[PDB]
Amino acid sequence: EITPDLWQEACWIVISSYFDEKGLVRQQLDSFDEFIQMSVQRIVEDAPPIDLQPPRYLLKFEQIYLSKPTHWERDGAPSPMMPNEARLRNLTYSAPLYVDITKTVIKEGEEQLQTQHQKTFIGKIPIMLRSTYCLLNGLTDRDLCELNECPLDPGGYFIINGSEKVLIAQEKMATNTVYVFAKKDSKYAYTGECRSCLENSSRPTSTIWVSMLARGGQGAKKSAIGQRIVATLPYIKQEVPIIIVFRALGFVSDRDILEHIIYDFEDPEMMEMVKPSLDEAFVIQEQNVALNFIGSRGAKPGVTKEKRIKYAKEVLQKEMLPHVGVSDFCETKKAYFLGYMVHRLLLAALGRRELDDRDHYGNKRLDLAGPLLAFLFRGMFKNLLKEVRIYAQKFIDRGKDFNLELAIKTRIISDGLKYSLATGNWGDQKKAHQARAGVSQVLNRLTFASTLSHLRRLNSPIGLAKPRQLHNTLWGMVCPAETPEGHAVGLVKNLALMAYISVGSQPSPILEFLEEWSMENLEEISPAAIADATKIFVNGCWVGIHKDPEQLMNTLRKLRRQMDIIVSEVSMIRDIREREIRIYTDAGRICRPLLIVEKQKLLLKKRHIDQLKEREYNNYSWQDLVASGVVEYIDTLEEETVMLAMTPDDLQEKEVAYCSTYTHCEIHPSMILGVCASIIPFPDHNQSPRNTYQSAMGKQAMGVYITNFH
Amino acid sequence: VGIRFCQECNNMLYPKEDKENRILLYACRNCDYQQEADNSCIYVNKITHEVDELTQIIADVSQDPTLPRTEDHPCQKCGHKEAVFFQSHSARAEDAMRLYYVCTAPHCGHRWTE
Amino acid sequence: RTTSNDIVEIFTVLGIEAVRKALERELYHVISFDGSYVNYRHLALLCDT
Amino acid sequence: AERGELDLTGAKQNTGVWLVKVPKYLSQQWAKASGRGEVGKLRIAKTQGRTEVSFTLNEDLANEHPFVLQSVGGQTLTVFTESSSDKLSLEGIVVQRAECRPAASENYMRLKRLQIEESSKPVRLSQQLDKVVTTNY
Amino acid sequence: KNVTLGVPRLKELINISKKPKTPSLTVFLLGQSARDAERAKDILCRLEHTTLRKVTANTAIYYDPNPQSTVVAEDQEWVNVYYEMPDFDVARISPWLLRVELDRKHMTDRKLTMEQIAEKINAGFGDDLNCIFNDDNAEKLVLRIRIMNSDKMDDDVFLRCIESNMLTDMTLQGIEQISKV
Amino acid sequence: GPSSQNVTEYVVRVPKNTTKKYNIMAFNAADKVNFATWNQARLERDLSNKPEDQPWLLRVNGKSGRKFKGIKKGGVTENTSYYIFTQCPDGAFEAFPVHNWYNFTPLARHRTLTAEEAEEEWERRNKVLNHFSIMQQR
Amino acid sequence: GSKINISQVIAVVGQQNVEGKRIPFGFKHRTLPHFIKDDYGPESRGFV
Ligand SMILES: [Zn+2]
Ligand SMILES: [Zn+2]
């Protein structure tokens, strides 16, 4: 039925199940697993075919193949590497990377004899222990002990040259999310940041800025002109107004431009606020002239006006908000998204909304080992393709033949990955100036607590006190007491114990379901109906509007709670004050479990507690607990619009009326503490500075750091 | 008061007067379309913004789980003796903390302040 | 008895000696606000030099 | 009379057409039907102050699809035609917008899940080799 | 109210910063005003910088080529009471009208009068802008503004420019760069 | 009467193939499109690129009438298939897939500033005098 | 030590403030998910 005054046992049993199923380092393990399983295949597949010529030569890559880690001894005999041997001999723990090259030849004589170079070696990918592609996976206690590897070791680290290196998650501004900021001193009054990128596969982040000119030069007609709106497009040296850009997208009718910018035509205040841009753009009236204008101010001005037109079209096509679409005919989506962008800017201008806080961890994500290795592999693969292209051109200008076996240089990927993972200069070796440092620190091994704390660690890119202060967002999300005492205090933080980082998934099934579920796509839509309906976002990109918000919310939540086609890791938002439904699926989000609450009672009933208490020989665990729709993954974004209960028996039971619509209930309040801060007894009774100091020491508290020390 | 565009040229219109008949004749400047000004008003500006937020509070905020809920202050059109309250939270609109109430019936939504 | 907290303003209005006296007073105020006391010799030397 | 000229006879006739969206499973049901000639029965029910539109699947095709009308005043829809003889013509102007939804409330997500593994059937992922491949060089 | 102190203050003092972070200025009243609270309030009003924004409530622009048009509903009274003597009306009156209201609460709080506000307005701009005088008997203390007669840029643009100029830096009362006292 | 409880049942037919492809033209309802003025129409592919992969162009009554430019839907309808129901004497509804979505927006006809001279009024970046007066000079 | 420390140990820790003001509204006009929206009570703004 229910769990009255038995809550201690129930909560600690469910936490037992959670830690027995997942563990402590699953963020690293799952990130790397997803990287190896999908990111490498996506990166290699989504690469430009190599075309060169006379006969035409085309090369296309194919499925990735991986094998267990091996050592290429001097005699050349393959030998399964072992983590112990890797540590002792200063041998990098890695496995070869194999691909299939399809060499298709065209001699302009129907001589297409395609040859498939199956299993072509291209480099060595470092492999991190206890991963599904490591050699320790699945071994029980007996084999691990027999193999001279500690059973208690959480793994989650690489081995380069015998030094155990561990990747540290890095914070960055969340991609594909329009922000608004108010620079205090800058010539722009308010500005809008929408750092955006495609689905973590094609090109790094490209930023679009939109801003408002501050009131200046008064006394003259400048005040009569008023505040003008300006945006600095990517790959454009200087700034440019907005309506000119909108006309560059191909929409000339000022009625249509205001329809895009404005959803309700009964707001004279905002009409007057946007009028200055209309007056400014009264000299540009056609698409071609606007394209010439924007292209004329690029880094390399075109030789002829057709050259400026082509450059402007290219930059507005590929480098302009890639996440919304780069499929040529997607100009309407770009136009609508820019309209929403400037609409949010105007709403910030009029004070109807409020400026988004930069240091709000619901507005930034964590680059885990997966995405970081994906970025490095992207760079190294581009370098390898360039090397192959130049080698092929040089060797075929003679015109004799071509050989892929010798053309491909496995040296480049292996050394690039090894170097970047070893010394921490994250990027190409020659470009250390622009390469972010501090990544892949040496694993700390003074104590088991130290090792776990180092595995579960974040880091900010900052070298002012605002970024380095604790924030409300970090409740149960990052350890509050823990932080380094030194100069890096605040920037470096450890995850909460129950915290779980989003490995990531694709948005295809969500878009399919939404499109089927009586949602109007954002092309065959009447513009006038936008205001009265609710917007929809999937990883930022606007995809349509819906007129039944709560029904859609209930359906999506029901699907998530059952692991239907929508993945459990996904979260969905509803800001009713703004009429939006934000759905996020990209990796890098951070999340924690919570208990669902319906009506006023927990869905966690005595039967679930009994089953979990009998977890052994019952094939019932945390995943099966989530199967019954009892515990729900609520990330920081979704925490923004829910209500939590500290303890059911204290809050859920009726009392003097304070709240009666608790949507979720905490697993246990103590879970907010981190690894090193958890061992503190009675941390509440202590003063927080001394909790912090002790949390620093727990790394330095010596002991039996690992069982197999000898 | 508002803004009008063409009838046949889909373009925005400025104000103008008639030199002969002395009447405000909204005339297209990009084209040659004109009409008489029934409103006879050209410009309005409420800098201090007396306009209360009630004109733009959305009704569906009532079914937001996270807002408070108060039993008193029943709705007018329907009794429905339980509703929600929340501050303006609108910078520069007004410096008055007057609580805004909205009824929480499935089809109601009559809003009021007191 | 009217004075100010700005230094350049009082310099341009009154004179360098006024800067001396006002800056000494203001430094004494800011140092002595939290209760810690310092001797007049050092403040006088800094303001003079 | 010119090749680039567009026929306007349909518009002059005030022809009215309806735009309707249908789910993927039903669309592939029609595709499997291959235009046999009869594919289903559409039912329209009008009350004293309400109208009901529903679509019934053919029993042979399977071995209810209620329709929700949409406002058409927000935009004007017209259908033209590009004939194989290069003679563009305008069929008419859309007069009503209709949407199709499934009757299933929970079981339909099973079909959605199946379609999801079908779509994720060709998504490619790396494979693990038990033994190192020694067929290179 | 408080003034910054401590490490940033010491930095700002050891440097000779051309802008203070929190500039402040203590004043002592000389004679009877020192003890008289009413006189202290009078000096407060005399020193506090009061721009047109802080006292005006709403602004409007209208088109009234005939002074007897009286487009506003309740403007006939003072309009007629002022226009019986046609001050250079025949020459030109710039049909573009500018209408503003001064909120009574701010009027009473800052203890200034609208007649001397109009005096300052017409004195600062001289005779290149005609002003209209209204009485306090009306529920709304309306103030009508028109353009000179003896004269590119049209007239509405110029009228809006003058509106913004008067709004930002008319300097109705007080001494500039004194935000609050 | 019968309308108070009228019930209608029509057939649904889907021909396997049509000799003439079926597409759609969409106008903004705010555009205020009037088909009475549709005395003559020409629809031709654009020449800006200089075929099937290029935007369409529409002209109304020659140069005298308004002008529309066609745009193909950038998105793909992998999960959707829009059909048009046309009334016929037999009473059997016929559902036809729509090949492409061709949106058209009006093209203004007037003296339009060109970029070569457009650089001239950029020196009047913010000092552009009498915005109304700019168009008469051309 | 000081008498304020004795008060904190014995009676009441006292108001906790950041940058002078009380706990800022990091979330949508609330300090943590556990408190009802738009609350300025002592328990819900930092007081211990
Ligand atoms: Zn026109
Ligand atoms: Zn009600």
Swiss-Prot record, chain B:
Keyword Ion transport assigned: no
A Pfam cross-reference name: Zn_ribbon_TFIIS
Subcellular location: Nucleus, Nucleolus
Binding site for Zn(2+) 1: 6, 9, 28, 31
Keywords for the protein's UniProt record, in alphabetical order: Acetylation, DNA-directed RNA polymerase, Metal-binding, Nucleus, Transcription, Zinc, Zinc-finger
GO biological process: maintenance of transcriptional fidelity during transcription elongation by RNA polymerase II; transcription by RNA polymerase II; transcription initiation at RNA polymerase II promoter; transcription-coupled nucleotide-excision repair
InterPro entries attached to this UniProt entry: DNA-dir_RNA_pol-M_15_CS, Rpa12/Rpb9/Rpc10/TFS, Zn_ribbon_RPB9, Zn_ribbon_RPB9_C, Znf_TFIIS
Alphabetized Gene3D superfamilies for the sequence: 2.20.25.10
CDD domains, A to Z: Zn-ribbon_RPB9
Residues in C4-type zinc fingers: 6-31
A GO MF label: nucleic acid binding
GO cellular component, one term: nucleolus
Residues annotated for Zn(2+) 2 binding in this entry: 75, 78, 103, 108
Main location, first listed in the record: nucleus
Zinc finger boundaries on the chain: TFIIS-type: 71-113
Keyword Zinc-finger: yes
Family (UniProt): Belongs to the archaeal RpoM/eukaryotic RPA12/RPB9/RPC11 RNA polymerase family.
Record note on quaternary structure: Component of the RNA polymerase II (Pol II) complex consisting of 12 subunits.
Protein's job: DNA-dependent RNA polymerase catalyzes the transcription of DNA into RNA using the four ribonucleoside triphosphates as substrates. Component of RNA polymerase II which synthesizes mRNA precursors and many functional non-coding RNAs. Pol II is the central component of the basal RNA polymerase II transcription machinery. It is composed of mobile elements that move relative to each other. RPB9 is part of the upper jaw surrounding the central large cleft and thought to grab the incoming DNA template.
Protein name in the entry: DNA-directed RNA polymerase II subunit RPB9
Swiss-Prot record, chain D:
Positions of post-translational N6-acetyllysine modification: 21, 32, 121
GO cellular component, one term: transcription factor TFIIF complex
Gene Ontology MF: a single term: RNA polymerase II general transcription initiation factor activity
Domain of life from the UniProt record: Eukaryota
Keyword terms of this UniProt record: Acetylation, DNA-binding, Nucleus, Phosphoprotein, Transcription, Transcription regulation
Localization in the cell: Nucleus
Modified residues (Phosphoserine): 126
Chief location of this protein within or outside the cell: nucleus
Keyword Nucleus: yes
GO terms, biological process: positive regulation of transcription by RNA polymerase II; transcription by RNA polymerase II; transcription elongation by RNA polymerase II; transcription initiation at RNA polymerase II promoter
N-acetylalanine: residues carrying this PTM: 1
Subunit structure, as described in the record: Heterodimer of an alpha and a beta subunit. Interacts with HTATSF1 and GPBP1. Interacts with URI1. Interacts with GTF2B (via N-terminus); this interaction is inhibited in presence of GTF2F1.
Purpose: TFIIF is a general transcription initiation factor that binds to RNA polymerase II and helps to recruit it to the initiation complex in collaboration with TFIIB.
Family: Belongs to the TFIIF beta subunit family.
Name of protein: General transcription factor IIF subunit 2
Protein's gene: GTF2F2
Segment of the intact protein contained: 2 to 153 of 249
Curated annotation (Swiss-Prot), chain F:
PTM annotation (Phosphothreonine): residues: 114
PTM text: Phosphorylated on Ser and other residues by TAF1 and casein kinase II-like kinases.
Taxonomic lineage of the native organism: Eukaryota, Metazoa, Chordata, Craniata, Vertebrata
Subcellular location: Nucleus
Organism (species): Homo sapiens
Expression induction or repression: Up-regulated in response to enterovirus 71 (EV71) infection.
Subunit architecture: Heterodimer of an alpha and a beta subunit. Interacts with GTF2F2, CTDP1, TAF6/TAFII80 and URI1. Interacts with GTF2B (via C-terminus and preferentially via acetylated form); this interaction prevents binding of GTF2B to GTF2F2.
Portion of the parent chain present: 5 to 180 of 517
Function, as annotated: TFIIF is a general transcription initiation factor that binds to RNA polymerase II and helps to recruit it to the initiation complex in collaboration with TFIIB. It promotes transcription elongation.
Name of protein: General transcription factor IIF subunit 1
Family: Belongs to the TFIIF alpha subunit family.
Domain of life, per lineage: Eukaryota
